[PDB]
mmCIF file of N, CA, C and O in Angstrom:
data_model
loop_
_atom_site.group_PDB
_atom_site.id
_atom_site.type_symbol
_atom_site.label_atom_id
_atom_site.label_comp_id
_atom_site.label_asym_id
_atom_site.label_seq_id
_atom_site.Cartn_x
_atom_site.Cartn_y
_atom_site.Cartn_z
ATOM 1 N N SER A 359 -20.848 -2.735 23.783
ATOM 2 C CA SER A 359 -20.591 -3.500 24.331
ATOM 3 C C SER A 359 -21.300 -4.275 26.214
ATOM 4 O O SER A 359 -23.112 -3.177 26.613
ATOM 5 N N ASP A 360 -21.612 -5.610 26.663
ATOM 6 C CA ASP A 360 -22.034 -6.199 27.214
ATOM 7 C C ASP A 360 -21.407 -5.780 29.157
ATOM 8 O O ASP A 360 -22.330 -5.570 29.692
ATOM 9 N N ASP A 361 -20.116 -5.137 28.982
ATOM 10 C CA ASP A 361 -19.524 -4.900 30.029
ATOM 11 C C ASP A 361 -19.408 -3.047 29.507
ATOM 12 O O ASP A 361 -18.903 -2.398 31.042
ATOM 13 N N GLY A 362 -21.188 -2.337 29.032
ATOM 14 C CA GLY A 362 -20.972 -0.374 30.220
ATOM 15 C C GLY A 362 -20.321 -0.206 29.470
ATOM 16 O O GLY A 362 -19.965 1.164 29.516
ATOM 17 N N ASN A 363 -19.449 -0.217 27.607
ATOM 18 C CA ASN A 363 -18.564 0.788 27.254
ATOM 19 C C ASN A 363 -19.042 0.493 25.770
ATOM 20 O O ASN A 363 -19.686 -0.896 25.159
ATOM 21 N N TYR A 364 -19.265 1.513 25.383
ATOM 22 C CA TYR A 364 -19.266 2.193 23.725
ATOM 23 C C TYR A 364 -17.875 1.954 23.093
ATOM 24 O O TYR A 364 -17.328 2.307 23.364
ATOM 25 N N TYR A 365 -17.747 1.052 22.208
ATOM 26 C CA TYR A 365 -16.012 0.777 21.166
ATOM 27 C C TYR A 365 -16.225 1.310 20.236
ATOM 28 O O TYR A 365 -18.127 0.231 19.025
ATOM 29 N N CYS A 366 -15.805 2.117 19.837
ATOM 30 C CA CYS A 366 -15.324 2.012 18.193
ATOM 31 C C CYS A 366 -15.186 0.987 17.340
ATOM 32 O O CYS A 366 -13.763 0.580 17.963
ATOM 33 N N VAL A 367 -16.399 0.167 15.942
ATOM 34 C CA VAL A 367 -15.047 0.308 15.036
ATOM 35 C C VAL A 367 -14.964 0.795 14.189
ATOM 36 O O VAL A 367 -15.828 0.896 13.416
ATOM 37 N N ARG A 368 -13.246 0.293 13.995
ATOM 38 C CA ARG A 368 -12.227 0.426 12.858
ATOM 39 C C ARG A 368 -12.394 -0.305 11.242
ATOM 40 O O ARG A 368 -11.728 -1.902 12.364
ATOM 41 N N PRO A 369 -11.942 -0.844 10.260
ATOM 42 C CA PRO A 369 -11.768 -1.500 9.772
ATOM 43 C C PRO A 369 -8.940 -1.326 9.862
ATOM 44 O O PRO A 369 -8.379 -0.211 10.441
ATOM 45 N N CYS A 370 -8.858 -2.910 9.916
ATOM 46 C CA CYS A 370 -8.102 -3.451 9.359
ATOM 47 C C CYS A 370 -6.496 -2.230 9.010
ATOM 48 O O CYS A 370 -7.431 -2.081 7.930
ATOM 49 N N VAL A 371 -6.512 -1.615 9.007
ATOM 50 C CA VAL A 371 -4.809 -0.712 8.456
ATOM 51 C C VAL A 371 -3.794 -1.816 8.700
ATOM 52 O O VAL A 371 -3.462 -1.940 9.601
ATOM 53 N N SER A 372 -3.372 -0.773 7.482
ATOM 54 C CA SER A 372 -2.088 -1.447 6.745
ATOM 55 C C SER A 372 -0.807 -0.236 7.466
ATOM 56 O O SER A 372 -1.428 0.874 5.930
ATOM 57 N N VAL A 373 -0.147 -0.621 7.522
ATOM 58 C CA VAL A 373 1.225 0.874 7.167
ATOM 59 C C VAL A 373 2.001 0.400 5.477
ATOM 60 O O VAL A 373 2.182 -0.546 5.459
ATOM 61 N N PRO A 374 1.357 1.588 4.932
ATOM 62 C CA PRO A 374 3.070 1.968 3.897
ATOM 63 C C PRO A 374 3.882 1.999 3.825
ATOM 64 O O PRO A 374 4.595 1.943 4.479
ATOM 65 N N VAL A 375 4.877 1.413 2.253
ATOM 66 C CA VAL A 375 5.767 1.497 1.831
ATOM 67 C C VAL A 375 6.491 1.489 1.148
ATOM 68 O O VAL A 375 6.239 1.636 0.265
ATOM 69 N N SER A 376 7.650 2.570 1.202
ATOM 70 C CA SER A 376 8.423 2.223 -0.150
ATOM 71 C C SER A 376 9.430 2.450 -0.100
ATOM 72 O O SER A 376 9.883 2.193 0.912
ATOM 73 N N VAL A 377 10.862 1.766 -1.501
ATOM 74 C CA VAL A 377 11.327 1.913 -1.775
ATOM 75 C C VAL A 377 12.295 3.148 -2.003
ATOM 76 O O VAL A 377 12.016 3.349 -3.682
ATOM 77 N N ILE A 378 13.113 3.097 -2.154
ATOM 78 C CA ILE A 378 14.172 4.476 -2.321
ATOM 79 C C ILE A 378 15.336 3.767 -2.794
ATOM 80 O O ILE A 378 16.117 3.154 -2.086
ATOM 81 N N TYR A 379 15.608 3.467 -4.419
ATOM 82 C CA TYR A 379 16.315 2.885 -4.893
ATOM 83 C C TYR A 379 17.441 3.037 -5.440
ATOM 84 O O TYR A 379 16.487 4.015 -6.116
ATOM 85 N N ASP A 380 18.530 3.891 -5.387
ATOM 86 C CA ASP A 380 19.675 3.920 -6.025
ATOM 87 C C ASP A 380 20.484 2.500 -7.252
ATOM 88 O O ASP A 380 21.147 1.980 -6.556
ATOM 89 N N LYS A 381 20.216 2.687 -8.359
ATOM 90 C CA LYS A 381 21.411 1.157 -9.214
ATOM 91 C C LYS A 381 22.597 1.084 -8.944
ATOM 92 O O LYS A 381 22.799 0.535 -8.976
ATOM 93 N N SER A 382 22.809 2.385 -8.593
ATOM 94 C CA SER A 382 24.686 2.762 -10.072
ATOM 95 C C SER A 382 25.062 2.269 -8.080
ATOM 96 O O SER A 382 25.952 2.244 -8.575
ATOM 97 N N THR A 383 25.614 3.402 -7.794
ATOM 98 C CA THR A 383 25.279 2.786 -5.549
ATOM 99 C C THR A 383 25.139 1.149 -5.573
ATOM 100 O O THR A 383 26.004 0.643 -4.066
ATOM 101 N N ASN A 384 23.883 0.986 -6.114
ATOM 102 C CA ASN A 384 23.466 0.150 -4.917
ATOM 103 C C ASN A 384 23.021 -0.365 -3.819
ATOM 104 O O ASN A 384 23.476 -1.227 -2.368
ATOM 105 N N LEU A 385 22.849 1.135 -3.139
ATOM 106 C CA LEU A 385 21.469 0.897 -2.122
ATOM 107 C C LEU A 385 20.437 1.547 -1.878
ATOM 108 O O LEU A 385 19.873 1.712 -2.859
ATOM 109 N N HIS A 386 20.270 1.281 -1.062
ATOM 110 C CA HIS A 386 18.199 1.223 -0.887
ATOM 111 C C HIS A 386 17.737 2.186 0.693
ATOM 112 O O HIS A 386 19.083 2.168 2.073
ATOM 113 N N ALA A 387 17.117 2.225 0.788
ATOM 114 C CA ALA A 387 15.999 3.309 2.333
ATOM 115 C C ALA A 387 14.916 2.591 2.305
ATOM 116 O O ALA A 387 14.187 2.793 1.309
ATOM 117 N N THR A 388 14.103 2.457 3.112
ATOM 118 C CA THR A 388 12.432 2.683 3.313
ATOM 119 C C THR A 388 12.015 3.606 3.952
ATOM 120 O O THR A 388 12.546 3.835 4.762
ATOM 121 N N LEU A 389 11.115 3.481 3.733
ATOM 122 C CA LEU A 389 10.127 4.632 3.940
ATOM 123 C C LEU A 389 8.945 4.831 4.185
ATOM 124 O O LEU A 389 7.667 4.187 2.965
ATOM 125 N N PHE A 390 8.389 4.623 5.067
ATOM 126 C CA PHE A 390 6.852 4.614 5.872
ATOM 127 C C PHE A 390 6.086 5.948 5.195
ATOM 128 O O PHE A 390 6.244 6.753 6.238
ATOM 129 N N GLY A 391 5.220 6.009 4.582
ATOM 130 C CA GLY A 391 4.875 7.960 3.888
ATOM 131 C C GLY A 391 3.771 8.007 4.486
ATOM 132 O O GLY A 391 2.199 7.538 5.138
ATOM 133 N N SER A 392 3.847 9.205 5.716
ATOM 134 C CA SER A 392 3.821 9.809 6.527
ATOM 135 C C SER A 392 2.769 8.973 7.026
ATOM 136 O O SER A 392 1.818 9.123 8.048
ATOM 137 N N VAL A 393 4.277 7.845 8.157
ATOM 138 C CA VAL A 393 3.763 7.319 9.639
ATOM 139 C C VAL A 393 5.116 7.914 10.589
ATOM 140 O O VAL A 393 5.836 8.237 10.191
ATOM 141 N N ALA A 394 4.921 8.390 11.665
ATOM 142 C CA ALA A 394 5.314 8.913 12.142
ATOM 143 C C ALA A 394 6.749 8.098 12.651
ATOM 144 O O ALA A 394 6.113 6.642 12.851
ATOM 145 N N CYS A 395 7.835 8.012 12.653
ATOM 146 C CA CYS A 395 8.886 7.524 13.229
ATOM 147 C C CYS A 395 8.546 6.840 15.297
ATOM 148 O O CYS A 395 9.036 5.571 14.729
ATOM 149 N N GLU A 396 7.967 7.515 16.143
ATOM 150 C CA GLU A 396 7.352 6.647 17.043
ATOM 151 C C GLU A 396 6.918 5.398 16.804
ATOM 152 O O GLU A 396 6.339 4.523 17.053
ATOM 153 N N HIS A 397 5.516 5.934 15.959
ATOM 154 C CA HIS A 397 4.559 4.443 16.042
ATOM 155 C C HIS A 397 5.707 3.304 15.494
ATOM 156 O O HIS A 397 5.403 2.114 15.806
ATOM 157 N N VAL A 398 6.541 4.083 13.720
ATOM 158 C CA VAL A 398 7.154 2.895 13.310
ATOM 159 C C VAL A 398 8.752 1.534 14.803
ATOM 160 O O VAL A 398 8.338 0.761 14.586
ATOM 161 N N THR A 399 8.852 3.556 15.336
ATOM 162 C CA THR A 399 9.995 2.065 16.210
ATOM 163 C C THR A 399 9.109 1.099 17.414
ATOM 164 O O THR A 399 8.934 -0.078 17.437
ATOM 165 N N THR A 400 8.111 1.605 17.839
ATOM 166 C CA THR A 400 7.233 0.723 19.338
ATOM 167 C C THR A 400 6.670 0.167 18.659
ATOM 168 O O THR A 400 5.718 -1.467 19.026
ATOM 169 N N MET A 401 5.689 -0.483 16.870
ATOM 170 C CA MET A 401 5.364 -1.309 15.879
ATOM 171 C C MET A 401 6.686 -1.696 14.971
ATOM 172 O O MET A 401 6.548 -3.033 14.300
ATOM 173 N N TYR B 1287 -8.051 29.817 -14.728
ATOM 174 C CA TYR B 1287 -7.240 29.104 -14.057
ATOM 175 C C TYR B 1287 -7.556 27.942 -15.188
ATOM 176 O O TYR B 1287 -7.590 27.127 -15.787
ATOM 177 N N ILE B 1288 -6.042 27.710 -14.981
ATOM 178 C CA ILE B 1288 -5.615 26.502 -15.892
ATOM 179 C C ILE B 1288 -4.630 26.023 -15.113
ATOM 180 O O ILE B 1288 -4.454 25.581 -14.225
ATOM 181 N N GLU B 1289 -5.174 24.321 -15.284
ATOM 182 C CA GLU B 1289 -4.908 23.448 -14.397
ATOM 183 C C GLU B 1289 -3.498 22.732 -15.014
ATOM 184 O O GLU B 1289 -3.334 22.632 -16.546
ATOM 185 N N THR B 1290 -3.266 21.947 -13.983
ATOM 186 C CA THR B 1290 -0.993 21.655 -14.671
ATOM 187 C C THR B 1290 -0.987 20.385 -13.557
ATOM 188 O O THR B 1290 0.125 19.555 -14.373
ATOM 189 N N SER B 1291 -1.907 19.590 -12.705
ATOM 190 C CA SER B 1291 -1.033 18.464 -12.384
ATOM 191 C C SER B 1291 -3.119 18.052 -12.116
ATOM 192 O O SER B 1291 -3.763 18.434 -11.520
ATOM 193 N N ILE B 1292 -2.401 16.609 -11.536
ATOM 194 C CA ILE B 1292 -3.581 15.787 -10.113
ATOM 195 C C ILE B 1292 -2.979 15.319 -8.735
ATOM 196 O O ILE B 1292 -1.239 14.556 -9.069
ATOM 197 N N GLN B 1293 -3.726 14.882 -8.587
ATOM 198 C CA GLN B 1293 -2.622 14.151 -7.292
ATOM 199 C C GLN B 1293 -2.787 13.013 -8.008
ATOM 200 O O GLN B 1293 -2.832 11.700 -8.568
ATOM 201 N N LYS B 1294 -0.935 11.945 -6.872
ATOM 202 C CA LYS B 1294 -1.182 11.161 -8.429
ATOM 203 C C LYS B 1294 -1.070 9.485 -6.985
ATOM 204 O O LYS B 1294 -0.660 10.227 -5.515
ATOM 205 N N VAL B 1295 -2.036 8.744 -7.080
ATOM 206 C CA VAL B 1295 -2.774 7.716 -6.343
ATOM 207 C C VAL B 1295 -1.721 6.784 -6.867
ATOM 208 O O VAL B 1295 -2.254 5.878 -8.325
ATOM 209 N N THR B 1296 -1.561 5.779 -5.496
ATOM 210 C CA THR B 1296 -0.843 4.609 -6.102
ATOM 211 C C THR B 1296 -1.229 3.559 -5.304
ATOM 212 O O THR B 1296 -1.554 3.807 -4.143
ATOM 213 N N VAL B 1297 -1.962 2.412 -6.088
ATOM 214 C CA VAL B 1297 -2.429 1.322 -5.418
ATOM 215 C C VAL B 1297 -1.839 0.072 -4.811
ATOM 216 O O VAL B 1297 -1.205 -0.294 -5.723
ATOM 217 N N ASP B 1298 -1.790 -0.610 -4.058
ATOM 218 C CA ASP B 1298 -1.517 -1.722 -3.899
ATOM 219 C C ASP B 1298 -2.737 -2.843 -4.207
ATOM 220 O O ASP B 1298 -3.555 -2.615 -3.557
ATOM 221 N N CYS B 1299 -1.647 -3.694 -5.055
ATOM 222 C CA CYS B 1299 -2.779 -4.725 -5.827
ATOM 223 C C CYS B 1299 -3.172 -5.925 -5.231
ATOM 224 O O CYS B 1299 -4.400 -6.244 -4.882
ATOM 225 N N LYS B 1300 -2.421 -5.951 -4.022
ATOM 226 C CA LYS B 1300 -2.464 -7.416 -3.228
ATOM 227 C C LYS B 1300 -3.456 -6.826 -1.444
ATOM 228 O O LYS B 1300 -4.201 -7.543 -1.906
ATOM 229 N N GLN B 1301 -3.208 -5.895 -1.489
ATOM 230 C CA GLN B 1301 -4.512 -5.513 -0.195
ATOM 231 C C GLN B 1301 -5.779 -4.403 -0.829
ATOM 232 O O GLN B 1301 -6.690 -4.987 -0.075
ATOM 233 N N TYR B 1302 -5.505 -4.938 -1.501
ATOM 234 C CA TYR B 1302 -6.677 -3.729 -2.758
ATOM 235 C C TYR B 1302 -7.636 -5.205 -2.741
ATOM 236 O O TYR B 1302 -9.238 -4.828 -2.671
ATOM 237 N N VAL B 1303 -7.048 -5.971 -3.430
ATOM 238 C CA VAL B 1303 -8.148 -7.024 -3.863
ATOM 239 C C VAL B 1303 -8.003 -7.944 -2.747
ATOM 240 O O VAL B 1303 -9.534 -8.670 -2.638
ATOM 241 N N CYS B 1304 -6.997 -8.964 -1.868
ATOM 242 C CA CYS B 1304 -7.564 -8.620 -0.634
ATOM 243 C C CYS B 1304 -7.403 -8.763 0.296
ATOM 244 O O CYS B 1304 -6.453 -8.570 0.565
ATOM 245 N N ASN B 1305 -8.196 -8.110 1.729
ATOM 246 C CA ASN B 1305 -8.189 -7.196 2.282
ATOM 247 C C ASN B 1305 -6.930 -8.135 3.295
ATOM 248 O O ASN B 1305 -7.951 -7.655 4.888
ATOM 249 N N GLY B 1306 -6.409 -8.212 3.310
ATOM 250 C CA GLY B 1306 -5.714 -9.513 3.512
ATOM 251 C C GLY B 1306 -6.098 -9.943 4.951
ATOM 252 O O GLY B 1306 -5.274 -10.598 5.949
ATOM 253 N N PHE B 1307 -6.591 -10.947 3.706
ATOM 254 C CA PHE B 1307 -7.313 -13.113 4.364
ATOM 255 C C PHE B 1307 -6.076 -13.743 4.258
ATOM 256 O O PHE B 1307 -6.220 -13.664 2.171
ATOM 257 N N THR B 1308 -5.946 -14.729 4.798
ATOM 258 C CA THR B 1308 -4.516 -15.170 3.587
ATOM 259 C C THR B 1308 -5.217 -16.373 3.151
ATOM 260 O O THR B 1308 -4.648 -16.154 1.970
ATOM 261 N N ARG B 1309 -5.995 -16.896 3.237
ATOM 262 C CA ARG B 1309 -6.916 -17.807 2.152
ATOM 263 C C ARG B 1309 -6.733 -16.914 0.866
ATOM 264 O O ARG B 1309 -7.428 -17.823 -0.066
ATOM 265 N N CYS B 1310 -7.583 -15.773 0.026
ATOM 266 C CA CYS B 1310 -7.936 -14.955 -0.521
ATOM 267 C C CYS B 1310 -6.517 -14.792 -1.020
ATOM 268 O O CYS B 1310 -6.400 -15.099 -2.897
ATOM 269 N N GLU B 1311 -5.139 -14.209 -0.275
ATOM 270 C CA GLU B 1311 -4.098 -13.911 -1.144
ATOM 271 C C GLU B 1311 -3.262 -15.511 -1.674
ATOM 272 O O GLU B 1311 -2.539 -14.837 -1.901
ATOM 273 N N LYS B 1312 -4.096 -16.600 -0.804
ATOM 274 C CA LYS B 1312 -3.728 -17.792 -1.929
ATOM 275 C C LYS B 1312 -4.271 -17.974 -2.622
ATOM 276 O O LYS B 1312 -3.717 -18.630 -3.912
ATOM 277 N N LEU B 1313 -5.484 -17.772 -3.285
ATOM 278 C CA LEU B 1313 -5.802 -18.239 -4.098
ATOM 279 C C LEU B 1313 -5.194 -16.980 -5.423
ATOM 280 O O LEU B 1313 -4.892 -17.059 -6.554
ATOM 281 N N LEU B 1314 -4.561 -15.851 -4.946
ATOM 282 C CA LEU B 1314 -4.686 -14.940 -5.737
ATOM 283 C C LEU B 1314 -3.170 -14.858 -6.177
ATOM 284 O O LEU B 1314 -2.379 -14.070 -7.383
ATOM 285 N N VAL B 1315 -2.221 -16.361 -5.731
ATOM 286 C CA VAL B 1315 -0.764 -15.389 -6.703
ATOM 287 C C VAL B 1315 -0.388 -16.685 -7.816
ATOM 288 O O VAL B 1315 0.387 -16.365 -8.418
ATOM 289 N N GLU B 1316 -2.368 -17.119 -8.402
ATOM 290 C CA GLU B 1316 -2.087 -17.078 -9.338
ATOM 291 C C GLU B 1316 -2.138 -16.795 -10.418
ATOM 292 O O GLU B 1316 -1.694 -16.509 -11.574
ATOM 293 N N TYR B 1317 -2.450 -15.332 -9.252
ATOM 294 C CA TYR B 1317 -2.401 -14.804 -11.010
ATOM 295 C C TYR B 1317 -1.697 -13.563 -9.894
ATOM 296 O O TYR B 1317 -0.015 -14.580 -10.077
ATOM 297 N N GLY B 1318 -1.293 -12.093 -10.524
ATOM 298 C CA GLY B 1318 -0.137 -11.525 -10.589
ATOM 299 C C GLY B 1318 0.479 -10.984 -11.188
ATOM 300 O O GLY B 1318 1.148 -9.724 -11.370
ATOM 301 N N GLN B 1319 0.776 -11.700 -12.152
ATOM 302 C CA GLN B 1319 1.175 -11.208 -13.348
ATOM 303 C C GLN B 1319 0.455 -9.853 -13.874
ATOM 304 O O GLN B 1319 0.243 -8.927 -15.054
ATOM 305 N N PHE B 1320 -1.274 -9.346 -13.022
ATOM 306 C CA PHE B 1320 -1.925 -9.235 -13.494
ATOM 307 C C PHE B 1320 -1.778 -7.819 -12.335
ATOM 308 O O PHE B 1320 -1.633 -6.324 -12.793
ATOM 309 N N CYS B 1321 -1.301 -7.906 -11.614
ATOM 310 C CA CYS B 1321 -0.925 -6.541 -10.102
ATOM 311 C C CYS B 1321 0.390 -6.091 -10.549
ATOM 312 O O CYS B 1321 0.516 -4.982 -10.341
ATOM 313 N N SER B 1322 1.252 -7.394 -11.099
ATOM 314 C CA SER B 1322 2.425 -6.386 -11.365
ATOM 315 C C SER B 1322 1.960 -5.795 -12.339
ATOM 316 O O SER B 1322 3.244 -4.748 -12.616
ATOM 317 N N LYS B 1323 1.162 -5.947 -13.583
ATOM 318 C CA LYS B 1323 1.589 -4.508 -15.374
ATOM 319 C C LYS B 1323 -0.147 -3.972 -14.266
ATOM 320 O O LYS B 1323 0.402 -1.923 -14.486
ATOM 321 N N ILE B 1324 -0.718 -3.498 -13.210
ATOM 322 C CA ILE B 1324 -1.899 -2.910 -11.933
ATOM 323 C C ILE B 1324 -0.453 -1.419 -11.475
ATOM 324 O O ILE B 1324 -0.309 -0.071 -12.010
ATOM 325 N N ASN B 1325 0.706 -2.840 -10.943
ATOM 326 C CA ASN B 1325 1.958 -1.248 -10.066
ATOM 327 C C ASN B 1325 2.941 -0.560 -10.348
ATOM 328 O O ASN B 1325 2.879 -0.197 -10.511
ATOM 329 N N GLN B 1326 2.982 -1.467 -12.391
ATOM 330 C CA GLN B 1326 3.929 -0.801 -12.570
ATOM 331 C C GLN B 1326 3.360 0.164 -13.772
ATOM 332 O O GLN B 1326 3.725 1.532 -13.924
ATOM 333 N N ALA B 1327 2.230 0.619 -14.012
ATOM 334 C CA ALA B 1327 0.989 1.213 -14.588
ATOM 335 C C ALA B 1327 1.074 2.685 -13.870
ATOM 336 O O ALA B 1327 1.245 3.442 -14.394
ATOM 337 N N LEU B 1328 0.550 2.504 -12.875
ATOM 338 C CA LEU B 1328 0.683 3.976 -12.206
ATOM 339 C C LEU B 1328 1.942 3.976 -11.633
ATOM 340 O O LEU B 1328 2.009 5.147 -11.655
ATOM 341 N N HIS B 1329 3.424 2.506 -11.348
ATOM 342 C CA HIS B 1329 4.333 4.334 -11.596
ATOM 343 C C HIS B 1329 4.354 4.942 -12.722
ATOM 344 O O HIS B 1329 5.099 6.813 -12.617
ATOM 345 N N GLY B 1330 4.170 3.927 -13.169
ATOM 346 C CA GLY B 1330 4.441 5.243 -15.191
ATOM 347 C C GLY B 1330 4.032 6.677 -15.287
ATOM 348 O O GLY B 1330 4.515 7.175 -15.490
ATOM 349 N N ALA B 1331 2.703 6.306 -14.496
ATOM 350 C CA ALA B 1331 2.040 7.500 -14.547
ATOM 351 C C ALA B 1331 2.358 8.527 -14.189
ATOM 352 O O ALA B 1331 2.413 9.573 -13.658
ATOM 353 N N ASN B 1332 2.495 8.209 -12.555
ATOM 354 C CA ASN B 1332 2.569 9.195 -11.683
ATOM 355 C C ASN B 1332 4.544 9.992 -11.985
ATOM 356 O O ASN B 1332 5.201 10.981 -11.708
ATOM 357 N N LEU B 1333 5.587 8.729 -12.308
ATOM 358 C CA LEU B 1333 6.343 9.487 -13.317
ATOM 359 C C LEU B 1333 6.503 10.283 -13.631
ATOM 360 O O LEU B 1333 7.493 11.655 -13.612
ATOM 361 N N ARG B 1334 6.017 10.321 -15.464
ATOM 362 C CA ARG B 1334 5.477 11.833 -16.441
ATOM 363 C C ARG B 1334 5.636 12.515 -15.808
ATOM 364 O O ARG B 1334 5.359 13.626 -16.432
#
């Protein structure tokens, strides 16, 4: 950059999401595969 | 050595085809019958 800094440029990423579903009781939950919980809370 | 399994890779059809571009996703809604078959086909293979 022109401000004297070298910047790494990575591609834009997306957090994975999965649904845990129990049909008999009609219950569900969310699974963010390989994502730390702190990142989910902050973003 | 006897192999017993392989990695289970699942693919997001919407993110793979359109890289998060809203203009591409608008065209892809005409599809989706094909994305729904790819998502379910890989689900069955990983389930078995």
